Amino acid sequence: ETITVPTPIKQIFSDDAFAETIKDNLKKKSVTDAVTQNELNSIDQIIANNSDIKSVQGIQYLPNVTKLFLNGNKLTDIKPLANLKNLGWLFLDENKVKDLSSLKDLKKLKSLSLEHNGISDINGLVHLPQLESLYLGNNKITDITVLSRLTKLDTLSLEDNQISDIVPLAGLTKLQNLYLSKNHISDLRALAGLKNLDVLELFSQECLNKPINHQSNLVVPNTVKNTDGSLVTPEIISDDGDYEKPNVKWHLPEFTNEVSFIFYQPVTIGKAKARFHGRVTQPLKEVYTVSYDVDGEVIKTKVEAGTRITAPKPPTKQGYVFKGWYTEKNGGHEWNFNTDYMSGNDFTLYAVFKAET
Ligand SMILES: [K+]
C-alpha cells in the first residue's frame, strides 16, 4: 500500500474518472504524470461529486485523507477505503453501496452519509460507536436496532425509509437534529426523553395494519400515540366513520376492501417543535360463512370470498363411510375443494354417507 518509484497516476487509480480526480487534486497536467508517495501523502481532502466514478481502487495509497466527498457516482465496493485510518468525513449519497463491512476499522469516522443507496441492513454500523452525524435518508431500512449502540450521535436522518419501531432511539439523549418524516411511525413514546432536541421532523407517516374481516359494524382501535402515550384524535375518517374513544367505528352494510383515517398532532419535545401527521390504513377481507351440515347438526366456518376452501377433517359415522360434501341434502353435486372457490354468499354443504358392506 505504498509506492517506491515515481508512478503514473493512471497506473495507480484504474478508474479513468478517479484518475482525473487525483490529477486535478495534485494540480498535475496529465494522468500520465508520474507521482511520488510524498505527493500522495499530502492529500487531505478529495472532492469528487457527480464525476461518474465507478471504483476508487488506488485510494489505499492515500494514508492521510480525512474527508472524502463522493456523492453522485456509481460506486458499489468501498473495500479500498478500509484502511484509511484517519478518515473523518465520508459522503456517499446516490451510489449503490450496501456492503458496509469495509467501514469496520474506520475508528475516526465522525460523519457518515449514505442517502439513496438502496440500503436495508445497517448492522455493520455497530463498529462505528464514535459516530456523531449519520444520514440514511431515502433507503429501505426497517430495523434500526443497531442504532442504540451509537450514543454519540447528535445529528441523525432516517427520513423516507420503512421504520415503525423507533424504540432503539430512546436512549440517544445527545440527539439534537432528528429527521423521521416519511416512515411507518405511529407511536412517539420512544422520543419522550430526548430533552436536547432542537430540530425534529415527523411529517407524513404511512401506517399499515394487518388485514381483518369486513363487518357491517366495524370497530378498530386507534393506535396513534403521543410522547406521553395518550391517543391522538383522528383528523378525518374514511367511509363516514366516527371516533368513539379509544376506537374508530364504521357502518359498512356493503363490502369495501379498505377503511382508513388521517391524524395530525403538534408535538413539542424539549425545545423542538414538530408536526406529527399521517394515515392509518386498514385492509378488509370479504368473508361469508360455510355451514357444514352433518345429519342436521351444523358447524360454521368463515371463508374469504374467492379463495379455496380447505376441507375439514372428515366426519366419522360408525357403520358408514364418508363420501363427501354436497350442495344439497339429497342430490346436488359434490363440492370440489380445488376448483370450486368460495361463493360471494353464505351457503351450506351436506355430508353424505354410504352404509358399510
Ligand atoms: K375506503
mmCIF file of N, CA and C in Angstrom, residues 237-353:
data_model
loop_
_atom_site.group_PDB
_atom_site.id
_atom_site.type_symbol
_atom_site.label_atom_id
_atom_site.label_comp_id
_atom_site.label_asym_id
_atom_site.label_seq_id
_atom_site.Cartn_x
_atom_site.Cartn_y
_atom_site.Cartn_z
ATOM 1 N N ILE A 237 -61.792 10.707 8.995
ATOM 2 C CA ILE A 237 -62.016 9.269 8.941
ATOM 3 C C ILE A 237 -62.750 8.934 7.654
ATOM 4 N N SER A 238 -62.343 7.846 7.014
ATOM 5 C CA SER A 238 -62.932 7.461 5.746
ATOM 6 C C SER A 238 -64.314 6.855 5.948
ATOM 7 N N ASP A 239 -65.036 6.748 4.838
ATOM 8 C CA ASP A 239 -66.218 5.904 4.768
ATOM 9 C C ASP A 239 -67.213 6.264 5.873
ATOM 10 N N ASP A 240 -67.322 7.573 6.151
ATOM 11 C CA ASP A 240 -68.281 8.173 7.082
ATOM 12 C C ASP A 240 -68.128 7.667 8.514
ATOM 13 N N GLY A 241 -66.951 7.181 8.889
ATOM 14 C CA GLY A 241 -66.757 6.658 10.226
ATOM 15 C C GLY A 241 -66.674 7.741 11.293
ATOM 16 N N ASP A 242 -66.667 7.278 12.539
ATOM 17 C CA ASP A 242 -66.694 8.136 13.709
ATOM 18 C C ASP A 242 -65.669 7.649 14.717
ATOM 19 N N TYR A 243 -65.256 8.566 15.578
ATOM 20 C CA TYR A 243 -64.353 8.276 16.682
ATOM 21 C C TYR A 243 -65.161 8.136 17.961
ATOM 22 N N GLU A 244 -65.021 6.996 18.627
ATOM 23 C CA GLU A 244 -65.619 6.761 19.941
ATOM 24 C C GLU A 244 -64.473 6.296 20.830
ATOM 25 N N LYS A 245 -63.741 7.250 21.376
ATOM 26 C CA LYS A 245 -62.502 6.979 22.095
ATOM 27 C C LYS A 245 -62.649 5.724 22.955
ATOM 28 N N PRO A 246 -61.737 4.740 22.854
ATOM 29 C CA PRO A 246 -60.477 4.719 22.102
ATOM 30 C C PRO A 246 -60.581 4.064 20.726
ATOM 31 N N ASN A 247 -61.786 3.908 20.196
ATOM 32 C CA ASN A 247 -61.966 3.139 18.980
ATOM 33 C C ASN A 247 -62.458 4.011 17.833
ATOM 34 N N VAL A 248 -62.171 3.556 16.617
ATOM 35 C CA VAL A 248 -62.773 4.091 15.405
ATOM 36 C C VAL A 248 -63.849 3.115 14.946
ATOM 37 N N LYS A 249 -65.000 3.652 14.542
ATOM 38 C CA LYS A 249 -66.182 2.856 14.220
ATOM 39 C C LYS A 249 -66.750 3.243 12.863
ATOM 40 N N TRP A 250 -67.121 2.226 12.086
ATOM 41 C CA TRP A 250 -67.713 2.396 10.769
ATOM 42 C C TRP A 250 -68.998 1.578 10.679
ATOM 43 N N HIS A 251 -69.916 2.045 9.835
ATOM 44 C CA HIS A 251 -71.102 1.297 9.440
ATOM 45 C C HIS A 251 -70.942 0.981 7.956
ATOM 46 N N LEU A 252 -70.768 -0.297 7.635
ATOM 47 C CA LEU A 252 -70.404 -0.737 6.292
ATOM 48 C C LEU A 252 -71.346 -1.850 5.842
ATOM 49 N N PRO A 253 -72.587 -1.513 5.499
ATOM 50 C CA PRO A 253 -73.508 -2.558 5.019
ATOM 51 C C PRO A 253 -73.029 -3.238 3.755
ATOM 52 N N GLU A 254 -72.301 -2.526 2.907
ATOM 53 C CA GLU A 254 -71.727 -3.085 1.696
ATOM 54 C C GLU A 254 -70.225 -3.287 1.882
ATOM 55 N N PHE A 255 -69.705 -4.378 1.317
ATOM 56 C CA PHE A 255 -68.276 -4.640 1.413
ATOM 57 C C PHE A 255 -67.483 -3.506 0.776
ATOM 58 N N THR A 256 -66.391 -3.120 1.438
ATOM 59 C CA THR A 256 -65.283 -2.392 0.832
ATOM 60 C C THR A 256 -63.986 -2.992 1.361
ATOM 61 N N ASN A 257 -62.931 -2.997 0.545
ATOM 62 C CA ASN A 257 -61.735 -3.717 0.950
ATOM 63 C C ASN A 257 -60.758 -2.873 1.754
ATOM 64 N N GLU A 258 -61.142 -1.658 2.149
ATOM 65 C CA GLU A 258 -60.258 -0.809 2.923
ATOM 66 C C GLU A 258 -61.043 0.286 3.620
ATOM 67 N N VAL A 259 -60.694 0.549 4.877
ATOM 68 C CA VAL A 259 -61.012 1.811 5.531
ATOM 69 C C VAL A 259 -59.704 2.417 6.042
ATOM 70 N N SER A 260 -59.757 3.707 6.399
ATOM 71 C CA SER A 260 -58.570 4.442 6.827
ATOM 72 C C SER A 260 -58.951 5.654 7.674
ATOM 73 N N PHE A 261 -57.940 6.249 8.313
ATOM 74 C CA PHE A 261 -58.119 7.546 8.958
ATOM 75 C C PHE A 261 -56.784 8.282 9.039
ATOM 76 N N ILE A 262 -56.877 9.609 9.027
ATOM 77 C CA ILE A 262 -55.754 10.528 8.997
ATOM 78 C C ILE A 262 -55.634 11.229 10.340
ATOM 79 N N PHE A 263 -54.396 11.546 10.732
ATOM 80 C CA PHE A 263 -54.138 12.156 12.026
ATOM 81 C C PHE A 263 -53.136 13.298 11.909
ATOM 82 N N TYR A 264 -53.251 14.229 12.857
ATOM 83 C CA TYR A 264 -52.428 15.427 12.940
ATOM 84 C C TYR A 264 -52.258 15.818 14.403
ATOM 85 N N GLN A 265 -51.013 16.036 14.813
ATOM 86 C CA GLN A 265 -50.700 16.329 16.203
ATOM 87 C C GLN A 265 -49.479 17.233 16.326
ATOM 88 N N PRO A 266 -49.625 18.476 16.779
ATOM 89 C CA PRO A 266 -48.434 19.273 17.085
ATOM 90 C C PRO A 266 -47.707 18.685 18.279
ATOM 91 N N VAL A 267 -46.383 18.653 18.185
ATOM 92 C CA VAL A 267 -45.541 17.976 19.157
ATOM 93 C C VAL A 267 -44.435 18.923 19.594
ATOM 94 N N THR A 268 -44.158 18.945 20.894
ATOM 95 C CA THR A 268 -43.032 19.690 21.443
ATOM 96 C C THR A 268 -42.238 18.751 22.333
ATOM 97 N N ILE A 269 -40.941 18.632 22.065
ATOM 98 C CA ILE A 269 -40.038 17.848 22.899
ATOM 99 C C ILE A 269 -38.818 18.710 23.168
ATOM 100 N N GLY A 270 -38.574 19.010 24.432
ATOM 101 C CA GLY A 270 -37.531 19.961 24.743
ATOM 102 C C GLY A 270 -37.843 21.259 24.041
ATOM 103 N N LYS A 271 -36.896 21.725 23.246
ATOM 104 C CA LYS A 271 -37.050 22.974 22.527
ATOM 105 C C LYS A 271 -37.580 22.787 21.112
ATOM 106 N N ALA A 272 -37.729 21.553 20.655
ATOM 107 C CA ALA A 272 -38.068 21.286 19.271
ATOM 108 C C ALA A 272 -39.579 21.196 19.086
ATOM 109 N N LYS A 273 -40.089 21.871 18.062
ATOM 110 C CA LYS A 273 -41.486 21.744 17.662
ATOM 111 C C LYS A 273 -41.577 20.970 16.355
ATOM 112 N N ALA A 274 -42.566 20.097 16.264
ATOM 113 C CA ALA A 274 -42.762 19.299 15.074
ATOM 114 C C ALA A 274 -44.250 19.089 14.859
ATOM 115 N N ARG A 275 -44.574 18.575 13.680
ATOM 116 C CA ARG A 275 -45.941 18.256 13.295
ATOM 117 C C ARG A 275 -45.988 16.801 12.859
ATOM 118 N N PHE A 276 -46.588 15.968 13.712
ATOM 119 C CA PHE A 276 -46.726 14.532 13.520
ATOM 120 C C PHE A 276 -48.054 14.274 12.834
ATOM 121 N N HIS A 277 -48.009 13.873 11.567
ATOM 122 C CA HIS A 277 -49.237 13.595 10.839
ATOM 123 C C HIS A 277 -49.026 12.419 9.904
ATOM 124 N N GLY A 278 -50.130 11.756 9.570
ATOM 125 C CA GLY A 278 -50.040 10.579 8.727
ATOM 126 C C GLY A 278 -51.390 9.889 8.579
ATOM 127 N N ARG A 279 -51.327 8.627 8.145
ATOM 128 C CA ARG A 279 -52.513 7.860 7.781
ATOM 129 C C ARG A 279 -52.392 6.424 8.265
ATOM 130 N N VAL A 280 -53.481 5.926 8.841
ATOM 131 C CA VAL A 280 -53.614 4.526 9.232
ATOM 132 C C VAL A 280 -54.523 3.860 8.210
ATOM 133 N N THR A 281 -54.028 2.817 7.557
ATOM 134 C CA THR A 281 -54.772 2.097 6.533
ATOM 135 C C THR A 281 -55.122 0.688 6.995
ATOM 136 N N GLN A 282 -56.372 0.282 6.777
ATOM 137 C CA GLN A 282 -56.918 -0.953 7.342
ATOM 138 C C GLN A 282 -57.535 -1.807 6.239
ATOM 139 N N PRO A 283 -56.813 -2.783 5.710
ATOM 140 C CA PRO A 283 -57.399 -3.644 4.676
ATOM 141 C C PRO A 283 -58.457 -4.551 5.273
ATOM 142 N N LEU A 284 -59.512 -4.795 4.496
ATOM 143 C CA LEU A 284 -60.640 -5.628 4.904
ATOM 144 C C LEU A 284 -60.835 -6.774 3.920
ATOM 145 N N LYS A 285 -61.150 -7.959 4.449
ATOM 146 C CA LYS A 285 -61.446 -9.142 3.646
ATOM 147 C C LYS A 285 -62.952 -9.400 3.601
ATOM 148 N N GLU A 286 -63.454 -9.754 2.416
ATOM 149 C CA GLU A 286 -64.867 -10.104 2.230
ATOM 150 C C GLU A 286 -65.070 -11.564 2.607
ATOM 151 N N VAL A 287 -65.822 -11.810 3.674
ATOM 152 C CA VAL A 287 -65.989 -13.146 4.226
ATOM 153 C C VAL A 287 -67.464 -13.501 4.275
ATOM 154 N N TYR A 288 -67.756 -14.783 4.040
ATOM 155 C CA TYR A 288 -69.080 -15.381 4.218
ATOM 156 C C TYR A 288 -68.900 -16.716 4.939
ATOM 157 N N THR A 289 -70.010 -17.365 5.268
ATOM 158 C CA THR A 289 -69.990 -18.499 6.177
ATOM 159 C C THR A 289 -70.374 -19.773 5.440
ATOM 160 N N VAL A 290 -69.531 -20.799 5.544
ATOM 161 C CA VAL A 290 -69.889 -22.138 5.082
ATOM 162 C C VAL A 290 -70.431 -22.910 6.276
ATOM 163 N N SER A 291 -71.673 -23.371 6.173
ATOM 164 C CA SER A 291 -72.256 -24.249 7.178
ATOM 165 C C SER A 291 -72.046 -25.700 6.756
ATOM 166 N N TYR A 292 -71.339 -26.459 7.579
ATOM 167 C CA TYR A 292 -71.184 -27.880 7.337
ATOM 168 C C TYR A 292 -72.280 -28.613 8.102
ATOM 169 N N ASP A 293 -73.159 -29.307 7.371
ATOM 170 C CA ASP A 293 -74.322 -29.989 7.934
ATOM 171 C C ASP A 293 -74.056 -31.492 7.944
ATOM 172 N N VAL A 294 -73.999 -32.064 9.136
ATOM 173 C CA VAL A 294 -73.851 -33.492 9.334
ATOM 174 C C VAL A 294 -75.159 -33.986 9.961
ATOM 175 N N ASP A 295 -76.026 -34.568 9.135
ATOM 176 C CA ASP A 295 -77.373 -35.037 9.514
ATOM 177 C C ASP A 295 -78.117 -34.036 10.398
ATOM 178 N N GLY A 296 -78.115 -32.777 9.983
ATOM 179 C CA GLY A 296 -78.858 -31.745 10.668
ATOM 180 C C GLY A 296 -78.072 -30.942 11.689
ATOM 181 N N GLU A 297 -76.953 -31.449 12.194
ATOM 182 C CA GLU A 297 -76.112 -30.668 13.098
ATOM 183 C C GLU A 297 -75.054 -29.915 12.305
ATOM 184 N N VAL A 298 -74.818 -28.654 12.688
ATOM 185 C CA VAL A 298 -74.042 -27.715 11.882
ATOM 186 C C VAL A 298 -72.804 -27.205 12.622
ATOM 187 N N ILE A 299 -71.701 -27.083 11.872
ATOM 188 C CA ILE A 299 -70.510 -26.320 12.237
ATOM 189 C C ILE A 299 -70.309 -25.244 11.177
ATOM 190 N N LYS A 300 -70.123 -23.996 11.620
ATOM 191 C CA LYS A 300 -69.978 -22.836 10.746
ATOM 192 C C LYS A 300 -68.513 -22.401 10.677
ATOM 193 N N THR A 301 -68.026 -22.136 9.467
ATOM 194 C CA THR A 301 -66.651 -21.711 9.235
ATOM 195 C C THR A 301 -66.683 -20.495 8.324
ATOM 196 N N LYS A 302 -65.961 -19.443 8.716
ATOM 197 C CA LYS A 302 -65.821 -18.248 7.892
ATOM 198 C C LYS A 302 -64.742 -18.452 6.838
ATOM 199 N N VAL A 303 -65.027 -18.027 5.609
ATOM 200 C CA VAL A 303 -64.087 -18.172 4.499
ATOM 201 C C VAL A 303 -64.137 -16.922 3.643
ATOM 202 N N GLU A 304 -62.966 -16.506 3.137
ATOM 203 C CA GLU A 304 -62.861 -15.304 2.321
ATOM 204 C C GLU A 304 -63.341 -15.581 0.909
ATOM 205 N N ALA A 305 -64.191 -14.695 0.411
ATOM 206 C CA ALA A 305 -64.796 -14.887 -0.894
ATOM 207 C C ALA A 305 -63.705 -15.023 -1.935
ATOM 208 N N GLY A 306 -63.911 -15.917 -2.886
ATOM 209 C CA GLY A 306 -62.964 -16.050 -3.969
ATOM 210 C C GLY A 306 -61.731 -16.879 -3.684
ATOM 211 N N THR A 307 -61.527 -17.353 -2.458
ATOM 212 C CA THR A 307 -60.413 -18.244 -2.149
ATOM 213 C C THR A 307 -60.872 -19.692 -2.154
ATOM 214 N N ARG A 308 -59.897 -20.600 -2.167
ATOM 215 C CA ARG A 308 -60.210 -22.009 -1.998
ATOM 216 C C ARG A 308 -60.586 -22.284 -0.553
ATOM 217 N N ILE A 309 -61.531 -23.198 -0.367
ATOM 218 C CA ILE A 309 -61.889 -23.682 0.959
ATOM 219 C C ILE A 309 -60.956 -24.833 1.267
ATOM 220 N N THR A 310 -60.423 -24.858 2.476
ATOM 221 C CA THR A 310 -59.670 -26.006 2.953
ATOM 222 C C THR A 310 -60.653 -26.981 3.580
ATOM 223 N N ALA A 311 -60.718 -28.196 3.041
ATOM 224 C CA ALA A 311 -61.681 -29.163 3.543
ATOM 225 C C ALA A 311 -61.361 -29.489 4.998
ATOM 226 N N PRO A 312 -62.363 -29.751 5.820
ATOM 227 C CA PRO A 312 -62.092 -30.087 7.219
ATOM 228 C C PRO A 312 -61.719 -31.557 7.366
ATOM 229 N N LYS A 313 -61.277 -31.907 8.560
ATOM 230 C CA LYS A 313 -61.145 -33.313 8.882
ATOM 231 C C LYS A 313 -62.519 -33.948 8.691
ATOM 232 N N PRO A 314 -62.619 -35.073 7.991
ATOM 233 C CA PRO A 314 -63.934 -35.575 7.622
ATOM 234 C C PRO A 314 -64.642 -36.182 8.818
ATOM 235 N N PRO A 315 -65.972 -36.203 8.812
ATOM 236 C CA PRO A 315 -66.692 -36.833 9.916
ATOM 237 C C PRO A 315 -66.550 -38.331 9.825
ATOM 238 N N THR A 316 -66.575 -38.988 10.979
ATOM 239 C CA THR A 316 -66.594 -40.445 11.032
ATOM 240 C C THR A 316 -67.881 -40.889 11.727
ATOM 241 N N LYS A 317 -68.760 -41.520 10.959
ATOM 242 C CA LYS A 317 -70.052 -42.005 11.417
ATOM 243 C C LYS A 317 -69.993 -43.524 11.448
ATOM 244 N N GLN A 318 -69.941 -44.109 12.645
ATOM 245 C CA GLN A 318 -69.696 -45.541 12.715
ATOM 246 C C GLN A 318 -70.810 -46.293 12.002
ATOM 247 N N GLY A 319 -70.422 -47.332 11.260
ATOM 248 C CA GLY A 319 -71.342 -48.057 10.412
ATOM 249 C C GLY A 319 -71.501 -47.485 9.023
ATOM 250 N N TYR A 320 -70.853 -46.359 8.726
ATOM 251 C CA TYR A 320 -70.928 -45.723 7.421
ATOM 252 C C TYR A 320 -69.537 -45.258 7.015
ATOM 253 N N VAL A 321 -69.383 -44.936 5.731
ATOM 254 C CA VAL A 321 -68.145 -44.377 5.191
ATOM 255 C C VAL A 321 -68.470 -43.044 4.537
ATOM 256 N N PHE A 322 -67.659 -42.036 4.826
ATOM 257 C CA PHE A 322 -67.936 -40.690 4.345
ATOM 258 C C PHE A 322 -67.647 -40.597 2.851
ATOM 259 N N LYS A 323 -68.597 -40.044 2.086
ATOM 260 C CA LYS A 323 -68.473 -39.942 0.634
ATOM 261 C C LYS A 323 -68.283 -38.521 0.106
ATOM 262 N N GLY A 324 -68.419 -37.485 0.931
ATOM 263 C CA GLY A 324 -68.091 -36.135 0.505
ATOM 264 C C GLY A 324 -69.133 -35.113 0.913
ATOM 265 N N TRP A 325 -68.845 -33.861 0.568
ATOM 266 C CA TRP A 325 -69.681 -32.716 0.914
ATOM 267 C C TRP A 325 -70.476 -32.274 -0.313
ATOM 268 N N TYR A 326 -71.803 -32.271 -0.208
ATOM 269 C CA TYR A 326 -72.663 -31.981 -1.348
ATOM 270 C C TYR A 326 -73.446 -30.682 -1.141
ATOM 271 N N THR A 327 -73.873 -30.082 -2.255
ATOM 272 C CA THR A 327 -74.560 -28.797 -2.216
ATOM 273 C C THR A 327 -76.044 -28.886 -1.884
ATOM 274 N N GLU A 328 -76.609 -30.085 -1.763
ATOM 275 C CA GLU A 328 -77.986 -30.257 -1.319
ATOM 276 C C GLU A 328 -78.043 -31.517 -0.469
ATOM 277 N N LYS A 329 -79.053 -31.596 0.409
ATOM 278 C CA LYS A 329 -79.141 -32.747 1.310
ATOM 279 C C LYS A 329 -79.235 -34.053 0.521
ATOM 280 N N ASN A 330 -80.067 -34.079 -0.512
ATOM 281 C CA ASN A 330 -80.136 -35.204 -1.434
ATOM 282 C C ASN A 330 -79.941 -34.659 -2.841
ATOM 283 N N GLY A 331 -79.059 -35.292 -3.602
ATOM 284 C CA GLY A 331 -78.721 -34.764 -4.908
ATOM 285 C C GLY A 331 -77.748 -33.602 -4.825
ATOM 286 N N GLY A 332 -77.929 -32.609 -5.689
ATOM 287 C CA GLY A 332 -76.909 -31.588 -5.778
ATOM 288 C C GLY A 332 -75.670 -32.203 -6.401
ATOM 289 N N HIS A 333 -74.525 -31.593 -6.123
ATOM 290 C CA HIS A 333 -73.274 -32.112 -6.648
ATOM 291 C C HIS A 333 -72.209 -32.006 -5.568
ATOM 292 N N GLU A 334 -71.113 -32.735 -5.764
ATOM 293 C CA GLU A 334 -70.069 -32.778 -4.751
ATOM 294 C C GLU A 334 -69.182 -31.550 -4.867
ATOM 295 N N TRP A 335 -68.935 -30.895 -3.739
ATOM 296 C CA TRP A 335 -68.014 -29.772 -3.734
ATOM 297 C C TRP A 335 -66.606 -30.267 -4.038
ATOM 298 N N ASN A 336 -65.955 -29.614 -4.985
ATOM 299 C CA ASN A 336 -64.578 -29.924 -5.371
ATOM 300 C C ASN A 336 -63.711 -28.857 -4.717
ATOM 301 N N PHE A 337 -63.023 -29.221 -3.628
ATOM 302 C CA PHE A 337 -62.302 -28.214 -2.853
ATOM 303 C C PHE A 337 -61.103 -27.636 -3.591
ATOM 304 N N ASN A 338 -60.801 -28.100 -4.805
ATOM 305 C CA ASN A 338 -59.732 -27.500 -5.592
ATOM 306 C C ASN A 338 -60.223 -26.538 -6.665
ATOM 307 N N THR A 339 -61.381 -26.792 -7.275
ATOM 308 C CA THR A 339 -61.849 -25.992 -8.398
ATOM 309 C C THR A 339 -63.084 -25.155 -8.093
ATOM 310 N N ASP A 340 -63.773 -25.407 -6.983
ATOM 311 C CA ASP A 340 -64.905 -24.589 -6.562
ATOM 312 C C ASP A 340 -64.406 -23.589 -5.518
ATOM 313 N N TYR A 341 -64.408 -22.309 -5.866
ATOM 314 C CA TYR A 341 -63.944 -21.277 -4.950
ATOM 315 C C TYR A 341 -65.107 -20.736 -4.115
ATOM 316 N N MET A 342 -64.760 -20.079 -3.015
ATOM 317 C CA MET A 342 -65.764 -19.616 -2.066
ATOM 318 C C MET A 342 -66.714 -18.623 -2.731
ATOM 319 N N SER A 343 -68.012 -18.911 -2.655
ATOM 320 C CA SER A 343 -69.021 -18.039 -3.240
ATOM 321 C C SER A 343 -69.057 -16.688 -2.517
ATOM 322 N N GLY A 344 -69.695 -15.708 -3.152
ATOM 323 C CA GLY A 344 -69.893 -14.416 -2.508
ATOM 324 C C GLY A 344 -71.137 -14.381 -1.628
ATOM 325 N N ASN A 345 -71.396 -15.467 -0.906
ATOM 326 C CA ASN A 345 -72.573 -15.559 -0.047
ATOM 327 C C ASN A 345 -72.414 -16.748 0.897
ATOM 328 N N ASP A 346 -73.180 -16.717 1.992
ATOM 329 C CA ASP A 346 -73.305 -17.872 2.874
ATOM 330 C C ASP A 346 -73.928 -19.042 2.121
ATOM 331 N N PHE A 347 -73.560 -20.261 2.504
ATOM 332 C CA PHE A 347 -74.227 -21.438 1.950
ATOM 333 C C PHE A 347 -73.871 -22.650 2.796
ATOM 334 N N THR A 348 -74.527 -23.765 2.486
ATOM 335 C CA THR A 348 -74.459 -24.975 3.289
ATOM 336 C C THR A 348 -73.910 -26.112 2.444
ATOM 337 N N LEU A 349 -73.072 -26.947 3.056
ATOM 338 C CA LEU A 349 -72.626 -28.202 2.463
ATOM 339 C C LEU A 349 -73.061 -29.366 3.339
ATOM 340 N N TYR A 350 -73.501 -30.450 2.701
ATOM 341 C CA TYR A 350 -74.133 -31.569 3.394
ATOM 342 C C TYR A 350 -73.251 -32.806 3.307
ATOM 343 N N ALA A 351 -72.989 -33.417 4.456
ATOM 344 C CA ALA A 351 -72.217 -34.646 4.481
ATOM 345 C C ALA A 351 -73.063 -35.791 3.945
ATOM 346 N N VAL A 352 -72.462 -36.645 3.115
ATOM 347 C CA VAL A 352 -73.142 -37.799 2.521
ATOM 348 C C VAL A 352 -72.379 -39.052 2.916
ATOM 349 N N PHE A 353 -73.106 -40.071 3.361
ATOM 350 C CA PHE A 353 -72.508 -41.315 3.814
ATOM 351 C C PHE A 353 -73.120 -42.486 3.064
#
